[model samples]
Target chain A: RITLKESGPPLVKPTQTLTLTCSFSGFSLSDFGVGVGWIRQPPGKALEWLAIIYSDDDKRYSPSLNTRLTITKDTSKNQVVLVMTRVSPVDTATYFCAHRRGPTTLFGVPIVNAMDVWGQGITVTISSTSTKGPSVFPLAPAAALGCLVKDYFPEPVTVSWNSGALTSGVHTFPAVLQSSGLYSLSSVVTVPSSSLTCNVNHKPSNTKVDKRVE
Target chain B: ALQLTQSPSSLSASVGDRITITCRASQGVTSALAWYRQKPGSPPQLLIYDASSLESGVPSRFSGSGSGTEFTLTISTLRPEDFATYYCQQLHFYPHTFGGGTRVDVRRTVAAPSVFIFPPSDEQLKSGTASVVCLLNNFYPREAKVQWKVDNALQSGNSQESVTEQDSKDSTYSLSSTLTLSKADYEKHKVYECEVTHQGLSSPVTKSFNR
Candidate 1:
């Protein structure tokens, strides 16, 4: 049996360091049959592997992460440590701990290698200190309806929707990026009796977004 | 680009009830749709691909159909273990998007996986060849991936794997992968690695050995 615990700060500004730790338990570290690594996904994007470390101190890092990240382990505490430096807003992403089992014939019984488990991801949002909100609302197009959220600074926002399961019908989202700075996202989907929910998590800012619904 | 919409949001179904979840896209996706099943606190399971084809090891009762922008995911009869959230995704678009998951309620659940490794057979060693097998038993959702490494360096080439269907009317799955080695290879590096991956288990399993 094995378990992994992850810890890190979720909010950080540009040029700061984000230190993450993956503390493991239930499995003996002296066995040396397991290896750990870091992986991350940009908002609404695919996962990208960052780096990996074995108990023996051998390390492999992704090309882009080589200079920005450092991995270390504490044998006594059975933990793997990762410190990422010089992080800019582009580094705002969700990070996860990945473990791969190694072939261990050392203890008489052998172990095969594979990605055995992953830690629940910790989302790190890199943003400015400003806590202002954005303008968000729905739109109607020739084909379907859409949502728009505009100019929230130091930004990375979450977008989620629920298209009611309508019978005998069909569904953006090819999210369109506008020529100007703001983002106008569009989509079309069918729902029997439900209003699709596409909420942006930057919530409303008392300062920026107007409360009027058109 | 494609926009996908799933309907009903969610539904309640007892074991043995008929079930259908549909997804409609803003544009025709043809057969580029894939379906996934996600339970609370677990990774999504890939069920259907290429629009209507069920993945290997998926039960016959769990099936898919329809084409173009409009598609349907039909489970002819629901099983107790079938209760979960289901989502539809489009692979046609470069940046693939998934539909909001449809939640289904059923009864019963399976246990997490227990993993182990089997050593090379005597015959294999006598022939100066070695193959190690990693087995995963009693796992549900069938969401896992296998990789191999020798001396902590990822084994990128020459690996074979197999996953068994829901076992003889049971919802649990069994998975295995074989890594072939030579006496000369292990003669220098003593560790034999068998890695088993299952999302149901919090951490992946690894059982090892020495030459």
Candidate 2:
């Protein structure tokens, strides 16, 4: 059995940097060949591989996790640390530390390689208000699309398409805005793979739409 | 350091055989063992972790049970692709170690006839005058070794050949060797053997053919 201990400040404000530490007991760093990795799971969602840190070698790897997030390890102390900057409410999610093994081989040749061990995930929440911005040009045949917030929110906003009373595939894009307070959010929705109307919706307050893309 | 001992190093069963591999830990590891399957030319795939939880995308037929020192890797229904050797590794401590592998072979049980025929027609027709063709079949994993044995003596100048697995479910494999003998020496009663070898415990299987 494994025990997990988390240490850090309890409450964090918007735009404040967030840092959390994970400490493990009942297992040693030397016992595992594959190092530890951190994963994020949004509330009521599936788990995603965030990044992995090699304890013995200090090397960090991740295709999605930005370089702004840093992972550090203290092998002598058996501790792993994760740091994230420019935080927002959407960043809230459970994080986990997994132990992995190296690839297996046949006749000295390497084959399939994947992580096989995982720890219970720890959930963290971000408390802050997201800033709103102006809407950009909507693509043709798209029912609706737009930017909900500016700067502070880094992830792509959700785009729901309805054409001829029919809903098409869902599209998501990152929020892009300019400094001069005059910003534009662009989105496109097509009808039956043909024409479409773009609807951009922005929520300044909770559950309130400030603008609509058309 | 933890030492792991595995049992039933070699076994033979039909297509639906229920095979079990037991891993015993020297000390108390709680639940820190994993099972993996490595096919020839391919990497090892994770089958079971922490002794019980099955990896995502793995079929339900492959299940792992047991805890701590004693763990079992079970294949509910053994398909042809599942015939490759299986191994168990312990994650309870450093310097991880794997158990000796267990090889499962398909049972081949046919009796040879006692009647004899002098100067077989097939051998005489191929001697010095016609090209002799030898064909091997029913091989799996593309890792078996094939060689020619003439009258209990190994023969040279035979080409080594390999083939890709036709599908993931093929268990048996095959190969062949060819030789030309003098018409006078091409007796019908002469015997030839085809031998194949793979890693792990089960001894190599040889098939005898008469010219």
Candidate 3:
């Protein structure tokens, strides 16, 4: 199954609830014969396994999310959602959706628990969001596109066109800024796509947000 | 896993300008620190030495100048041909570590261009004759190195050609290499791979193709 979602906002606040959603198109939780789990990765930090939800048994397991987190499954919608309470800047991290599969064995029996197939991770932040001004264009074909991120966060964001298809003429530029402050920057693209998108990233928190045009 | 972090992670310089990228070690390592350039779909290229120096045949405009926990990759001039993504890595350690990449772009933005090409096919190979051409799309600084290989073996006697200045305003370039072999060579199911290498990066990458 393929899942789609955004990362996080670069800046969030304390006690704020951060949520991320993972929507799958092809496979159902019932057919996978396992549960789904969410993972977190902080800026310049290693990834941490956050929580797991069993589709068959409707059970959720999370050390960090136990009392403050919730994992909900919608078999009809074929999606799994994660919600986290008391959000903090420290909660910033990229979140990914994954499927878990394994077989329980008797004593001396081997049980394999495998997590295969992962969606692209989403990054989020709990601070004030930046309004760096509208995107400027006429980006040279095949040129690398980049933008100046106002607030400095380790989370990476992807740039793509919104209306037209992307070609070699356009390319997305990486975020380049010294610290998190006010700045004016441009994103580049080699492709010929018309509009570009900067999707928000979600963390261990199952937050769902729409795509944003840059 | 060893983590390699870079300082001044991002920078902007004009053509004819010189710039340097510094990479540091989270832990000590004896392995070589390598550099590379990553373009979409293309593989990474090796640049630099134990601490400083240039890769064979690289332009004088590009040079490696650093060592130890404090290593740097410097470009003497920011030629338009020099814009692309640059990465630093340490081979001294196992499971190698790579610094985040730095991308170079034109000062003023324009509509991005697309690269075009028609890779060889297995059916064409069955005919016992095949020609491969790689068209680099929307790339600049004209510093990329592209080569042809058969069954993982580098093919000798192949010509490497580059086309630059296609348009005065935008400096675009394309590289092509030809591989000539007998039907027997084709029947061997030997794979043809295109490899591109650049400086300030760790390992070289092989392009994926069918047949």
Model 2 lDDT, residue A190, Cα: 22
DockQ of 1: 0.01
Which residues of candidate 2, in runs, are more than 4 Å off? A1-114, A117-214, B108-211
lDDT of 3 at A119: 60
Mark the 10 consecutive residues where model 2 chain A has the least summed lDDT: A138-147
Which sections of candidate 3 miss by over 4 Å? Answer: A1-14, A31-33, A58-62, A102-112, A134-214, B1-211
Please provide, for model 1 over A1-214, each residue's C-alpha lDDT reduced to its tens digit, 9 standing for 90 to 100. 6677678898788898989998888664465656787766665444455777776777777667778889998878888899999987678777777565555475555632123456777778765555556555443221233344433443445554543323122212222222222333322223333443454555434433322111
In the range B135-189, model 1's lDDT, one tens digit per residue, is 5554665667676767775775565555544443554555555565676785687
Candidate 3 on B54-132: residue-level lDDT in tens? 5556677767665657677788888875766677756454334457667555453332222332344344455564435
Q: Per-residue lDDT tens digits of candidate 2, residues A86-143?
A: 7776677666665665435466444512345555555565664345433332221112
lDDT of model 2 at residue A57?
A: 60
Indicate the residue-level lDDT of A139 in model 1.
37
Restricted to chain B, the TM-score per model reads 0.55, 0.54, 0.48
Docking class of 3: incorrect
Q: A49, model 2: CA deviation in Å?
A: 24
